[PDB]
A paper describes a structure:
Ams1 is transported by selective autophagy into vacuoles.
Here, we determine the tetrameric structure of Ams1 from the fission yeast Schizosaccharomyces pombe at 3.2 Å resolution by cryo‐electron microscopy. Ams1 shares a conserved active site with other enzymes in glycoside hydrolase family 38, to which Ams1 belongs, but contains extra N‐terminal domains involved in tetramerization.
Author numbering:
A (entry chain C): 445 to 493
B (entry chain C): 839 to 936
C (entry chain D): 248 to 1077
D (entry chain D): 100 to 198
E (entry chain B), F (entry chain A): 2 to 50
G (entry chain A): 199 to 247
The structure:
Amino acid sequence: LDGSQVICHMPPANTYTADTNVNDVLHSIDQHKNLVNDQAGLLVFGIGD
Amino acid sequence: FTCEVDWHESCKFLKVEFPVDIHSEFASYETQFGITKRPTHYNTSWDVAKFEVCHQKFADYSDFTYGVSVLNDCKYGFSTHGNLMRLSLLRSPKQPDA
Amino acid sequence: NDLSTINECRNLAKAFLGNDIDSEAVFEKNNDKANVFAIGHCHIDTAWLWPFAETRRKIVRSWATQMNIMDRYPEYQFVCSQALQYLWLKEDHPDVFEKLKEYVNQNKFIPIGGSWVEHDTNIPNGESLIRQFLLGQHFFEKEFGVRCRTFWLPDTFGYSSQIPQICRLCGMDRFLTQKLSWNNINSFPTSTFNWVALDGSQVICHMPPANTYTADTNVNDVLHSIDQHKNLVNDQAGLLVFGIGDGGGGPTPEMLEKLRRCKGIANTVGYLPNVKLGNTVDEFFDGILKRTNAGQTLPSWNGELYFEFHRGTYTTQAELKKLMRKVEIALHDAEYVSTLASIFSKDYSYPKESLQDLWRDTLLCQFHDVLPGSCIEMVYKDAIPIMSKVLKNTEALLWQAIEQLGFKKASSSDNKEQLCLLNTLPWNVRGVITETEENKLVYFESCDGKGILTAAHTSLKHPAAAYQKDDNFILVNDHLRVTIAPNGLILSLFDLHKEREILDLKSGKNHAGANQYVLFEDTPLSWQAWDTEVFSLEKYEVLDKGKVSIKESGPLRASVVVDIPISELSHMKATISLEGYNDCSEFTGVNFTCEVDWHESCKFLKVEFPVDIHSEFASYETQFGITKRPTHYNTSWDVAKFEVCHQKFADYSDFTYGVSVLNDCKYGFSTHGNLMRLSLLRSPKQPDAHADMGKHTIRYAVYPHSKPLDSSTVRAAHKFNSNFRLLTRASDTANLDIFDAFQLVGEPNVILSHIKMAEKGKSIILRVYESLGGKSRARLVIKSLTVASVTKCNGLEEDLEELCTLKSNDYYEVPIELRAFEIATFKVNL
Amino acid sequence: SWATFWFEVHIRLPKSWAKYEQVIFQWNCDNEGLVYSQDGVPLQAFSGSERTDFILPDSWKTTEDTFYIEMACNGMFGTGAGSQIAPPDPNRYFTLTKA
Amino acid sequence: TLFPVLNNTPVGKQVDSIYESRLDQFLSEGQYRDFNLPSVYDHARIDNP
Amino acid sequence: TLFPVLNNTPVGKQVDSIYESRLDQFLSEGQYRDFNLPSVYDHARIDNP
Amino acid sequence: DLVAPNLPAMALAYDFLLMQQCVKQLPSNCWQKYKARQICNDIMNTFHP
Ligand SMILES: [Zn+2]
Ligand SMILES: [Zn+2]
């Protein structure tokens, strides 16, 4: 609200419980909603919840 | 206002509405350490999603000259949309909690 | 080689189109569940790539074609918007106009729009829009017997947030537009919605789903007219507007034949939607309102319809916009003093014909292409002279009325003791500092009357002072202290009452002073004089090679002068001034005046001020109200608003303090994260080889105030824009100050915008409007008059309710109550 | 560009056209034109190649009459000089292709 | 007239997926069976021995 | 650190079509030839007889 | 004519042409398209004739 900022990132694959599949590894970069700014997505794999 | 509610309804949402004769384009709700101004007009899809918002202690709705606030001490969901302030009192869900 | 095969081919075709395509009976089958409504339209841009003398011929050459076609095809109906075009057709060909009104009475050739011209709705002031509707509707009620209920505006480059209320005032509760389908960033959410104004007034707006008002009645046009409807759940009906517009004749007859065959296809093989041709636009909107329970179910759009395209239209053709605002203010003053003279004097008739012609020639140059600066060089070599002539004639009318009141011009020979100042603002301007004959600063104070300000022989209580600290120029005042670097950039703008800096040069990208002049490489994508693009801010050059000199240090107005070299062939001279004052009300802030020798090519000169204000929105002023735009680029709807339209001031205030930027010629502003940026000058080249080359006088004031946007800022903006004419009393028996006859005493946010004489009667029309956004109450004080009645009329001056007028000692004090952003109009019958 | 021409058109239909219920006059100069009758009543416009046919109004096919064409040397959107939004061409010469 | 001058109650545009999937629960005999159509079907079913 | 605490200058997300079609004018010899690359090509072309 | 072309300008022209083709052709989900677009944008922001 006041101006303080944090560098926020969202894993492009819409789950923090990915499976390191081929489509997970793909979506982790190809589903990046703003690729013009930075071409790097985080893959968070596991079985959560 | 103090509601003593014997609540036993199933899948019902008890809310309370006040039309307030205030014509502003936004409503100031209170959040952690500040004030968040939400729309009141359903213009874009980003405003149709905000049909019920979170507020800590008071939901304000004021034009340039006069204003109405709604304060509370247990409720957290409010909805101001076009002169009609609506405080969400009680839900009766059933799926994870019978 | 055989012509009977033609007829048996037609018979083979009749298995797909049906048997009735040869006649007008195709539209009589299945005319109950109609989805696409077809109407013929001929959009003739009054002056876009041709002079007005060419449109005077385009009008007749298109409308006569339409008369003959409507004679041949009985089911065909036609619409045309501008009433000025009807006036031109009746001036050129009166017999053609007689036949035209015959067609109009025969329910064909529907006159729609209800306005004078298809004006731009962003740049002209609110009274200009009300005059558009007044003139158009009066012309239509006079010539024909129709009063248009549908505001037709398909080509305007952006809609203001108060248009629905102005439409509701002037009897038009419908709206049709097509331009908002050209959004290259955000597809508009709906196609048939309820456009709700700033205050709550609503019009049922519809956009032809096919993104052109120049459709071709093809199969894909008829399809898209229903299948491209952006909200089909609310109402399944789209309008097909077919023709050849943008300055050309209407629909060819083969388009009517293709429409007949499309209806035949829909009748026989039901894939195409059921076109209905024998229905007007009013019947179409009546059907829309009937099927949705009086529009209570359609989506709503509250506020401004932002057109995310043609954003350089605010800045291009700067001199025409300066002249337009000067002419609007001069017309206000002209009919104000003329109303006073006709009220008080005995042998003075209110100049109805002169003012009517002046308003016509002003509204003609408010076309949605002429005013926004999107025409060829010849159109502007025609529009600048007619606009300057309108300004000169308005000044002459004002002077005739004033001399009838008992004053005369300054003449630069009367003594300074006998100089007065005409105010014409509906409140007491505490003091005005002005030059008289030799750049001689004279201060005019009025402690008693709001109309005539006398000169002030006594000195000022709080004078300005321009001195020089170590290699820095300080314009000190009682309120502000402006520390200016040796290179022109304001290093500091300190407030002396609330001890706080108002710049924030540390954070943000702007790290070197406020009032920073920047040259952006404009280079738009497609349309050069229309568009400015969001990528133009990445290439820029800061002008930091200036040199500051103390121009004046007198008690009335301290001021430095900076000679800033823009480039080769281009130069500028920025005068930074701070005036002295008696009351804090008088203060207008730090004034800046740029003398720009502008010769750059595809450059955008803007001026930036970081303001140390952290709010999430900025309040700009629009016609009769305040529009709050974002400042954060959060969603795509905010990335489109990287440059917005504002009438007189752009405010940016947090809960405790605020900065406004007032102006009198510029219309484009951009507030985004502590950085306010006023767009000064564009240099397009495509429709105008020399668009803004020459000499420009750009005035703008940074007015810092110590609260959220209050009425003080609105009054300071109106004072900054107003013209204060130096008067001199002519007779000591009629020099009475009757300019306080009509006052508005009450809350300061209620502005007595306009005073006028009735269009038909001898009653006084007062256009009042609250300007900030709160339901207020006030009292119209009518001092030196005997008031027979005071009714509340609409925009066209038909009475609705009769107000209860009090009766004090000598005045009357009609008590009025205005809503959030209401535009009320009061007819005072004397 | 913007230059006006006035074509007095005098036609005589062949007699064999006692048939041919509809007779047309075609005019396809790349510019605007407006047919006036002998009395000055406008009847139909020509705009480039999208509007050429002018139906003779079943009245002066029997007797050889004359009408007038006020041809304005400019396109539907002015002259252009390269594109529609380009600055007008001071010299743009049009050619009559159909009469 | 029937068209109100003042519109002080905004109406939003119905989101496609939400209002589309809402129709699935009117004929569903699942969690909201008692509020929807599959509750007035029976009219006093009888199965006692 | 290098990451600023206060972010008082918002940055928008680049629209695809606009910033995509902008690249068309850097090599174009059309209206903006003098501001783009097809103006430093020549290096004193000579064609006089 | 008799030109003496700017060799680095022509090299940059070919580079920018290839990258603009990569922007126009590569699918809407490949990060190479957006990296090329960012580089083209920086080149256009960098070049002063
Ligand atoms: Zn969880
Ligand atoms: Zn137009």
